[PDB]
Design a protein around this motif. Structure first.
Motif, mmCIF file in Angstrom:
data_model
loop_
_atom_site.group_PDB
_atom_site.id
_atom_site.type_symbol
_atom_site.label_atom_id
_atom_site.label_comp_id
_atom_site.label_asym_id
_atom_site.label_seq_id
_atom_site.Cartn_x
_atom_site.Cartn_y
_atom_site.Cartn_z
ATOM 1 N N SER A 118 -23.912 145.055 -28.225
ATOM 2 C CA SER A 118 -23.916 146.465 -27.891
ATOM 3 C C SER A 118 -22.682 146.806 -27.046
ATOM 4 O O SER A 118 -22.051 147.851 -27.240
ATOM 5 N N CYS A 119 -22.324 145.909 -26.112
ATOM 6 C CA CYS A 119 -21.160 146.124 -25.266
ATOM 7 C C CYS A 119 -20.039 145.161 -25.640
ATOM 8 O O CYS A 119 -20.175 143.944 -25.510
ATOM 9 N N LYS A 120 -18.895 145.738 -26.018
ATOM 10 C CA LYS A 120 -17.724 144.975 -26.428
ATOM 11 C C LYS A 120 -17.128 144.233 -25.240
ATOM 12 O O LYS A 120 -16.553 143.160 -25.414
ATOM 13 N N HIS A 121 -17.292 144.791 -24.034
ATOM 14 C CA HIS A 121 -16.588 144.286 -22.870
ATOM 15 C C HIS A 121 -17.235 143.004 -22.346
ATOM 16 O O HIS A 121 -16.517 142.062 -22.061
ATOM 17 N N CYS A 122 -18.563 142.973 -22.167
ATOM 18 C CA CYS A 122 -19.229 141.788 -21.648
ATOM 19 C C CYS A 122 -19.930 140.985 -22.754
ATOM 20 O O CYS A 122 -20.419 139.891 -22.479
ATOM 21 N N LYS A 123 -20.044 141.555 -23.962
ATOM 22 C CA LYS A 123 -20.709 140.898 -25.086
ATOM 23 C C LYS A 123 -22.198 140.674 -24.799
ATOM 24 O O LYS A 123 -22.773 139.705 -25.269
ATOM 25 N N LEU A 138 -21.180 140.447 -14.554
ATOM 26 C CA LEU A 138 -21.045 141.834 -14.105
ATOM 27 C C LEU A 138 -20.353 142.643 -15.197
ATOM 28 O O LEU A 138 -19.559 142.109 -15.965
ATOM 29 N N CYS A 139 -20.713 143.915 -15.329
ATOM 30 C CA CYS A 139 -20.054 144.770 -16.294
ATOM 31 C C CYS A 139 -20.144 146.225 -15.847
ATOM 32 O O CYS A 139 -21.236 146.786 -15.672
ATOM 33 N N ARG A 140 -18.961 146.841 -15.752
ATOM 34 C CA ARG A 140 -18.816 148.216 -15.327
ATOM 35 C C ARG A 140 -18.859 149.150 -16.514
ATOM 36 O O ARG A 140 -18.719 150.354 -16.348
ATOM 37 N N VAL A 141 -19.096 148.602 -17.705
ATOM 38 C CA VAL A 141 -19.181 149.425 -18.898
ATOM 39 C C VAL A 141 -20.640 149.654 -19.273
ATOM 40 O O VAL A 141 -20.983 150.773 -19.587
ATOM 41 N N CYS A 142 -21.479 148.610 -19.311
ATOM 42 C CA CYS A 142 -22.877 148.807 -19.675
ATOM 43 C C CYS A 142 -23.795 148.685 -18.453
ATOM 44 O O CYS A 142 -24.978 148.936 -18.585
ATOM 45 N N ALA A 143 -23.272 148.303 -17.281
ATOM 46 C CA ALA A 143 -24.023 148.446 -16.035
ATOM 47 C C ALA A 143 -23.187 149.249 -15.032
ATOM 48 O O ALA A 143 -22.256 149.939 -15.436
ATOM 49 N N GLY A 201 -22.961 145.713 -11.200
ATOM 50 C CA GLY A 201 -24.226 145.023 -10.987
ATOM 51 C C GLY A 201 -25.329 145.472 -11.938
ATOM 52 O O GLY A 201 -25.501 146.653 -12.200
ATOM 53 N N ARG A 202 -26.117 144.508 -12.434
ATOM 54 C CA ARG A 202 -27.137 144.799 -13.418
ATOM 55 C C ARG A 202 -28.494 145.057 -12.767
ATOM 56 O O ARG A 202 -29.386 145.582 -13.434
ATOM 57 N N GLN A 203 -28.629 144.739 -11.479
ATOM 58 C CA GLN A 203 -29.915 144.897 -10.808
ATOM 59 C C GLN A 203 -30.280 146.379 -10.658
ATOM 60 O O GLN A 203 -29.410 147.258 -10.707
HETATM 61 ZN ZN ZN Z 1 -21.109 145.265 -20.787
#
Ligand code: ZN
Ligand code: ZN
Ligand code: ZN
Ligand code: ZN
Lengths: 25, 70
Positions: free
Chosen positions: B7-12, B18-23, B29-31
């Motif tokens: 779904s997210c190209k950046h973090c796969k 950590l991912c600033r695109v889907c979190a 942070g995903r929490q």
């Molecule tokens: Zn992501």
């Protein structure tokens, strides 16, 4: 106002339907 | 992850990253996904406690726009 959680739950619900557990052959 | 792949190209969709695109677009942070607001313009997520000023809880409005968009 949507939360990330609400988006994740929507996606899980859709995936669940795809399992098609209620279908016989 | 099938035809569409992640779904997210950046973090796969790696949950250990950590991912600033889907979190959270500020901290990655995903929490506390329940406390990350989704921008109704750019669709980025933001922890209520990462905003400045921090919000105590989820707003009761029809829409919410992030600091980048508003
Ligand atoms: Zn992501
Ligand atoms: Zn954050
Ligand atoms: Zn935005
Ligand atoms: Zn940005």
């Amino acid at each position: 106002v949507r939360t990330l959680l609400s988006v994740q739950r929507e996606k899980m619900a859709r995936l669940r339907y795809m399992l098609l557990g209620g279908v016989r052959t | 992850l099938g035809s569409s792949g992640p779904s997210c190209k950046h973090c796969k969709d790696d949950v250990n990253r950590l991912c600033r695109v889907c979190a959270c677009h500020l901290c990655g942070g995903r929490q506390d996904p329940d406390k990350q607001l989704m921008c109704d313009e750019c669709d980025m997520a933001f922890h209520i406690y990462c905003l400045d000023p921090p919000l105590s809880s989820v707003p009761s409005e029809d829409e919410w726009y992030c600091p980048e968009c508003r």
